Amino acid sequence: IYAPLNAVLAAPGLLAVAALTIPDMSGRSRLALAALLAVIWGAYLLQLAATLLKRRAGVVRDRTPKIAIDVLAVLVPLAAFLLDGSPDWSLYCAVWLLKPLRDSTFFPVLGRVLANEARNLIGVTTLFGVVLFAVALAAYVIERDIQPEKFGSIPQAMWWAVVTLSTTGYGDTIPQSFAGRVLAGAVMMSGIGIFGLWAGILATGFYQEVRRGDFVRNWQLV
Amino acid sequence: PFLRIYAPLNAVLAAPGLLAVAALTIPDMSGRSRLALAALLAVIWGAYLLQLAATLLKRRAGVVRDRTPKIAIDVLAVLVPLAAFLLDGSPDWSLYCAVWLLKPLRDSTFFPVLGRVLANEARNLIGVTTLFGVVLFAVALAAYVIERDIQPEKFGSIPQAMWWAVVTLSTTGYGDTIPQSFAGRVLAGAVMMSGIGIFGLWAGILATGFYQEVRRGDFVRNWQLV
Amino acid sequence: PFLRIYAPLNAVLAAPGLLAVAALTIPDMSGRSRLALAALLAVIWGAYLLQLAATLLKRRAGVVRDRTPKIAIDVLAVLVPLAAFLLDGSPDWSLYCAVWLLKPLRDSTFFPVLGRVLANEARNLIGVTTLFGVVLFAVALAAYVIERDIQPEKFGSIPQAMWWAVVTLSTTGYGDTIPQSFAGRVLAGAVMMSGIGIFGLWAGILATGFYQEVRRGDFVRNWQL
Amino acid sequence: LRIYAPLNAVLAAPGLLAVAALTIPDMSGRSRLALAALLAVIWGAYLLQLAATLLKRRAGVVRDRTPKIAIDVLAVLVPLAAFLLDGSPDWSLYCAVWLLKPLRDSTFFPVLGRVLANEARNLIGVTTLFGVVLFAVALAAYVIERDIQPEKFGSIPQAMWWAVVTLSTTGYGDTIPQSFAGRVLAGAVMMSGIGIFGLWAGILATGFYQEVRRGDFVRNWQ
Numbered sequence: 053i054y055a056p057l058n059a060v061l062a063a064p065g066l067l068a069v070a071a072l073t074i075p076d077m078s079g080r081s082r083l084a085l086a087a088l089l090a091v092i093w094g095a096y097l098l099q100l101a102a103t104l105l106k107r108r109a110g111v112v113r114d115r116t117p118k119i120a121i122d123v124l125a126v127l128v129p130l131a132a133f134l135l136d137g138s139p140d141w142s143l144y145c146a147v148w149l150l151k152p153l154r155d156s157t158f159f160p161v162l163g164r165v166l167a168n169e170a171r172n173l174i175g176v177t178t179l180f181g182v183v184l185f186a187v188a189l190a191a192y193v194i195e196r197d198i199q200p201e202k203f204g205s206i207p208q209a210m211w212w213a214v215v216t217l218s219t220t221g222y223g224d225t226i227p228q229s230f231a232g233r234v235l236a237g238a239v240m241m242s243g244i245g246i247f248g249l250w251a252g253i254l255a256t257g258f259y260q261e262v263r264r265g266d267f268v269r270n271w272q273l274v
Numbered sequence: 275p276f277l278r279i280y281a282p283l284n285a286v287l288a289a290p291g292l293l294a295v296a297a298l299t300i301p302d303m304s305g306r307s308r309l310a311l312a313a314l315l316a317v318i319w320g321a322y323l324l325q326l327a328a329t330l331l332k333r334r335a336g337v338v339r340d341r342t343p344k345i346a347i348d349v350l351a352v353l354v355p356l357a358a359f360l361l362d363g364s365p366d367w368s369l370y371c372a373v374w375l376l377k378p379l380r381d382s383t384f385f386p387v388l389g390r391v392l393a394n395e396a397r398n399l400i401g402v403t404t405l406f407g408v409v410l411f412a413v414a415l416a417a418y419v420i421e422r423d424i425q426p427e428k429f430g431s432i433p434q435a436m437w438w439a440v441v442t443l444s445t446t447g448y449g450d451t452i453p454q455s456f457a458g459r460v461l462a463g464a465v466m467m468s469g470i471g472i473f474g475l476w477a478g479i480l481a482t483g484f485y486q487e488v489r490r491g492d493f494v495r496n497w498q499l500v
Numbered sequence: 501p502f503l504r505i506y507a508p509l510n511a512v513l514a515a516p517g518l519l520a521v522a523a524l525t526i527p528d529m530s531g532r533s534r535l536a537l538a539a540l541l542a543v544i545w546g547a548y549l550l551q552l553a554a555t556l557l558k559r560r561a562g563v564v565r566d567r568t569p570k571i572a573i574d575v576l577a578v579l580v581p582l583a584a585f586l587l588d589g590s591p592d593w594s595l596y597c598a599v600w601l602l603k604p605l606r607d608s609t610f611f612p613v614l615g616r617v618l619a620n621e622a623r624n625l626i627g628v629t630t631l632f633g634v635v636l637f638a639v640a641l642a643a644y645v646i647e648r649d650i651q652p653e654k655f656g657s658i659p660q661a662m663w664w665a666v667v668t669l670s671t672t673g674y675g676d677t678i679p680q681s682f683a684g685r686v687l688a689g690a691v692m693m694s695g696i697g698i699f700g701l702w703a704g705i706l707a708t709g710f711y712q713e714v715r716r717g718d719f720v721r722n723w724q725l
Numbered sequence: 726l727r728i729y730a731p732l733n734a735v736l737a738a739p740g741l742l743a744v745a746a747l748t749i750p751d752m753s754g755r756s757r758l759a760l761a762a763l764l765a766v767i768w769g770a771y772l773l774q775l776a777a778t779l780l781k782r783r784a785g786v787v788r789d790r791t792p793k794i795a796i797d798v799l800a801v802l803v804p805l806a807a808f809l810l811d812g813s814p815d816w817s818l819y820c821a822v823w824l825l826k827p828l829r830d831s832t833f834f835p836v837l838g839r840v841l842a843n844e845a846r847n848l849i850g851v852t853t854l855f856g857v858v859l860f861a862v863a864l865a866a867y868v869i870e871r872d873i874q875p876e877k878f879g880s881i882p883q884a885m886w887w888a889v890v891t892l893s894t895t896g897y898g899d900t901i902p903q904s905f906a907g908r909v910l911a912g913a914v915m916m917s918g919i920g921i922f923g924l925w926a927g928i929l930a931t932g933f934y935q936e937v938r939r940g941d942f943v944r945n946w947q
């Protein structure tokens with residue numbers, strides 16, 4: 053109740069956005085949730101004024117990202133109220149998803165962790181892509197004839213690929229062949245490998261963040 | 275040899291205790307078994323009562339040690355199930371014996387270690403959670419807009435799209451809500467890749483947390499080694 | 501795979517062995533194949549009989565050494581499959597040849613390292629395991645009370661919720677049991693979220709465990725060079 | 726911008742999409758031809774790429790460029806062979822050799838090589854552990870579930886199908902143990918899965934960490 057200011061306001065606000073999309077809402081509740089949005093919207097309008105008009109920070113600073121979150125929090129929901137006539141106007145209040153990211157740290161840290169690992173992270177992604185395509189290609193050739201409706205194309209087998217490789221596994225597409233299921237099992241295993249490859253990179257990324265502070269204060273110790 | 279001999283004493287009693295709770299929830303339990311499982315609970319409740327006195331009657335052991343988390347579990351382990359026995363009349367009373375879940379926790383170590391790992395990395399850990407929540411909603415919002423019309427039974431509301439989103443993003447995928455349209459399936463794929471991304475984030479923070487835990491012992495090792 | 505043909509000689513034989521055990525369980529196998537697969541088992545078992553005699557008879561290798569686990573695997577590999585062959589009349593005898601699952605573990609350099617990594621983390625690893633059990637049960641208890649009346653056959657007891665709990669918490673999730681009410685599904689999401697939390701803990705502990713093995717790899721750096 | 730400057734990786738994207746596009750049933754005659762023409766242009770592009778990497782030798786005195794040559798050679802020859810040999814519509818599937826093209830002119834992969842090489846003994850050991858456990862669990866589930874479910878657990882290879890599905894934590898739902906004894910096993914298999922995930926993650930984390938130790942030795946020299 054001391055630090056989470058804007059993030060707390062976003063909580064019922066974004067829940068209210070979700071509440072309006074529920075079918076069979078009574079006129080009372082339909083308006084009550086809309087009124088809830090208005091109050092939360094009106095709360096951010098004070099917040100926008102509190103940042104713009106009050107100008108006691110220092111001499112040299114950068115506030116471009118922070119103001120942008122406050123600006124979009126009041127303009128987009130207002131533009132929806134004015135321009136959009138359909139009930140789908142309240143979906144535009146989703147811009148309040150930027151609000152919890154505003155006053156939270158870690159995101160400047162994640163920025164430089166992802167920056168120091170961008171070279172390696174993009175590499176894992178394209179590896180995932182290459183593996184996905186190949187894994188789908190094999191599953192297509194093996195299965196296309198038995199299941200023309202499920203494995204009839206590379207895209208169709210690609211659906212099975214991302215589902216199986218990421219180890220999500222819905223169950224709507226399953227290889228029926230022995231040769232297919234042996235491939236399937238190998239996709240699942242190599243999935244576990246990719247899981248750990250993301251974890252390996254990021255753990256080395258977060259380590260080198262602390263290592264930067266340890267060699268930063270270590271060189272400062274002299 | 276050492277980890278399975280030091281901790282399993284006070285914590286051991288919770289195992290048959292918590293299984294006895296789970297046993298009394300099964301329908302068609304014969305009176306013989308019904309009473310025997312209740313009798314088992316009472317014995318373990320009795321066993322924990324002597325454990326309560328052991329921490330209360332013992333006044334001297336060293337100089338200064340904290341026993342607030344240790345005694346609190348010992349108190350709750352005998353207070354709750356007895357209060358439920360007398361105040362609640364329905365057979366649901368023994369569900370309060372689930373308080374013994376705290377018994378194996380602060381009986382061994384690791385958890386005090388886990389505490390300071392979770393404390394020194396709380397900034398990042400809470401940040402990942404809020405990233406999960408934000409990505410969860412945005413993804414669900416998209417899934418709703420894409421597939422509310424085609425297949426109205428699912429994805430017909432943000433809540434329903436959020437139900438799919440958690441199932442998909444956590445890479446759980448029950449398979450009760452699966453997008454039909456190509457546009458929604460590409461999104462679904464993007465959710466599953468970013469799912470592994472979050473898995474790597476949790477594993478990334480905690481790997482750095484437990485690493486600092488050991489290197490914090492070096493600050494105690496550099497001061498006085500031999 | 502080019503240099504690992506004549507390197508794990510004792511482990512390579514286990515591959516066709518274990519796959520034969522799997523083949524003899526497939527229903528409606530032809531009489532010839534049934535006999536041929538059983539013949540393959542006896543040749544591999546025969547091969548281990550030479551392997552046992554090679555390690556038992558020959559003993560001239562150094563002065564100070566310890567090979568208790570290595571002999572333990574080889575002794576079982578010839579005694580157990582033979583005992584079943586003689587004593588078991590049912591076709592299930594060939595299942596006992598799964599003893600050769602220990603054979604790949606015999607010549608691996610990895611498992612000596614994994615053993616001491618698990619030994620260095622035993623305190624933490626059992627801690628994460630009990631944390632899984634506690635969270636499992638607590639979540640099951642919650643899922644039980646919520647879904648009792650709505651879903652009688654699928655959430656009617658704690659064990660039924662426990663089944664859902666491991667299915668959900670480990671993030672397996674077949675789809676056989678799912679909370680139906682809003683209340684239960686909010687919990688469900690939190691169980692899945694804590695799944696990712698537990699996953700990261702196991703990875704965190706073990707990553708620290710293998711990091712400390714590099715710390716242990718300062719024996720040749722501080723003493724030799 | 727910088728990595729997306731060489732067309733090697735960029736041209737592969739619409740190339741591989743074109744391979745996937747032709748597998749789709751009920752396509753328009755226009756697109757069917759158009760997508761093939763796109764593959765021919767991309768093929769000709771890689772031919773020009775092949776010529777540059779074969780004729781230029783002025784850069785440096787003595788080094789190695791074997792993998793890049795191998796990828797450029799395979800990117801033109803494999804499709805060319807399919808152009809000449811394959812008469813069926815399956816000819817365009819051989820353009821999936823351009824899966825080596827994103828890997829070609831990109832870093833991380835020289836790192837991923839030595840990271841796998843540094844933990845080579847460890848990584849295979851996890852895989853063989855996975856196999857042993859996979860079998861042991863499948864053998865167990867077979868004996869417990871074979872009578873009640875002959876269609877699902879009637880043989881070891883059938884239980885092995887479940888074992889990968891379950892242990893890799895994919896878990897479709899086409900095979901689920903019924904008996905209490907079988908279900909307690911199932912839960913225990915799911916648990917041990919989380920540990921194997923962590924093992925892969927642990928090994929690879931230690932692999933990438935040791936590469937950073939070498940980066941400290943590389944910063945010590947230069």
Ligand SMILES: CCCCCCCCCCCC[N+](C)(C)[O-]
Pocket residue numbers: 228229230233234235237238882883885886889
């Ligand atoms: C590399 C290990 C993963 C492969 C294991 C998968 C088992 C293959 C499934 C065989 C089942 C036989 N069939 C046709 C009845 O399904």
Ligand SMILES: CCCCCCCCCCCC[N+](C)(C)[O-]
Pocket residue numbers: 207208210211214454455456459460463464
């Ligand atoms: C950016 C991640 C890529 C995910 C790839 C997923 C491809 C899904 C396409 C499946 C086609 C769907 N359907 C029903 C038309 O066949």
Ligand SMILES: CCCCCCCCCCCC[N+](C)(C)[O-]
Pocket residue numbers: 659660662663666903904905908909911912913916
């Ligand atoms: C190691 C944790 C695994 C524990 C999960 C086992 C769940 C118990 C199975 C309950 C289902 C029994 N039955 C037949 C009543 O449904």
Ligand SMILES: CCCCCCCCCCCC[N+](C)(C)[O-]
Pocket residue numbers: 433434436437440680681682685686689690693
């Ligand atoms: C970790 C928090 C995320 C949990 C999200 C769970 C969404 C539950 C809403 C599903 C809709 C329920 N119902 C019955 C109305 O369909």
Ligand SMILES: [K+]
Pocket residue numbers: 218219220444445446671672893894895
């Ligand atoms: K999973």
Ligand SMILES: [K+]
Pocket residue numbers: 220221222223446447448449672673674675895896897898
């Ligand atoms: K699943």
Ligand SMILES: [K+]
Pocket residue numbers: 222223448449450674675897898
């Ligand atoms: K399913």
Ligand SMILES: [K+]
Pocket residue numbers: 221222223447448449673674675896897898
């Ligand atoms: K499923």
Ligand SMILES: [K+]
Pocket residue numbers: 219220221445446447671672673894895896
């Ligand atoms: K899954």
